[PDB]
Design a protein around this ligand. Sequence first.
Ligand SMILES: Cc1cc2nc3c(=O)[nH]c(=O)nc-3n(C[C@H](O)[C@H](O)[C@H](O)COP(=O)(O)O)c2cc1C
Ligand SMILES: CCn1cc(C2CC2)c2c([C@H](N)c3ccc(C(F)(F)F)nc3)n(C)nc2c1=O
Ligand SMILES: O=c1cc(C(O)O)[nH]c(=O)[nH]1
Length: 376
Amino acid sequence: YNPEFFLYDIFLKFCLKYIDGEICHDLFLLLGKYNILPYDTSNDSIYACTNIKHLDFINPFGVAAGFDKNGVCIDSILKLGFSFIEIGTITPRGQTGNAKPRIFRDVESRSIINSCGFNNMGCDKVTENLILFRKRQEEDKLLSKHIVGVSIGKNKDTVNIVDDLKYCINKIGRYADYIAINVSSPNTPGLRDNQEAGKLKNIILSVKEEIDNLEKNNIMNDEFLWFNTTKKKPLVFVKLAPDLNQEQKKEIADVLLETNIDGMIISNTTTQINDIKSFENKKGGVSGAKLKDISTKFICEMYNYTNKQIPIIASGGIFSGLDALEKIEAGASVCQLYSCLVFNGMKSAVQIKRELNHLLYQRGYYNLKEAIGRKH
Ligand SMILES: Cc1cc2nc3c(=O)[nH]c(=O)nc-3n(C[C@H](O)[C@H](O)[C@H](O)COP(=O)(O)O)c2cc1C
Ligand SMILES: CCn1cc(C2CC2)c2c([C@H](N)c3ccc(C(F)(F)F)nc3)n(C)nc2c1=O
Ligand SMILES: O=c1cc(C(O)O)[nH]c(=O)[nH]1
């Protein structure tokens, strides 16, 4: 019972019908900047705790990349009831993006189409913000167990992807719990060509290597170097696009097994949806419910491509507790939300968290970890 939630749900219906999508995004981020967003301070179910190696998540719901592309709103977003957040995608130097008429919504289909183009303030400034949060985190008990991941990418005009990725790792590595490599954005020309097994292999090795390089050349203990939640080196995940052929998707898996990737996010937006009349002749990748079923199979695909050896992070059309369980049973260990917060709002995390707890009770599972890969 926290009345501070519904006050915002009143205005939600207004926004979906009148306010431009990005104007709603900036407004939301502004609210959390001033710490006036609702609070979910109830303990989470110990049966819902999940992990990926030494990453321990209090609950299995964070917000996906592109939500807080610059980490100026981490404190409040997390306090809504999310265990972690993925900030970014970030690039070395700031970028403005594309034609500001970028993101559009369709309420009925619960879908979104976006053509942002990695609009961010740059690696240096976003690093300043994350540092401020980590300091606030040490003096706040509502942030003591929460995790922050950083999605990294390349500028549109970069000549080589590896160079940009490394500059980020070397500037913001110490403050990240994990690092997700975004080589799947459909709104930045090219990039997806890096999904080729050869270049993807070199990419993964370079990133994993670059993170390993931060320890050696220090004068202090490993305890003080990592100013993060784990106090350990950041793990390396990779985000993949759904628009691949089955042959490339087994090539991809081969790279992840060969390179010992710590995780595989599944998945980003798609460019194959063409049955939304309000989205006809509009550029960008589609998000929301229409991406649900497509991504789910991609989990089963990659969970069987990779021989169950790489944990999977679920992202795509997740709105309800049963949606999350679908992702879990397919092979995912954790879930990310975005469109759910666009259409369901600030009450999303609490809503979806109560629904998942209740479903695990009826399905007979003792805890969440028991459900990964069970309807295969
Ligand atoms: C406006 C917008 C911006 C996004 N920006 C990023 C991004 O910068 N990096 C990334 O990896 N994914 C980005 N995404 C994709 C989301 O992180 C997520 O994968 C996708 O929206 C599916 O989630 P959903 O179906 O729950 O909405 C973005 C999506 C939208 C709608
Ligand atoms: C696709 C961009 N993006 C993002 C959001 C997410 C940022 C939180 C959108 C929302 C959101 N559910 C919301 C609720 C309440 C308010 C307000 F103003 F009441 F505080 N603002 C935004 N909405 C309605 N549209 C979004 C969007 O387009
Ligand atoms: O990975 C990404 C990136 C973008 C963007 O910045 O435009 N948009 C998406 O839908 N996915």
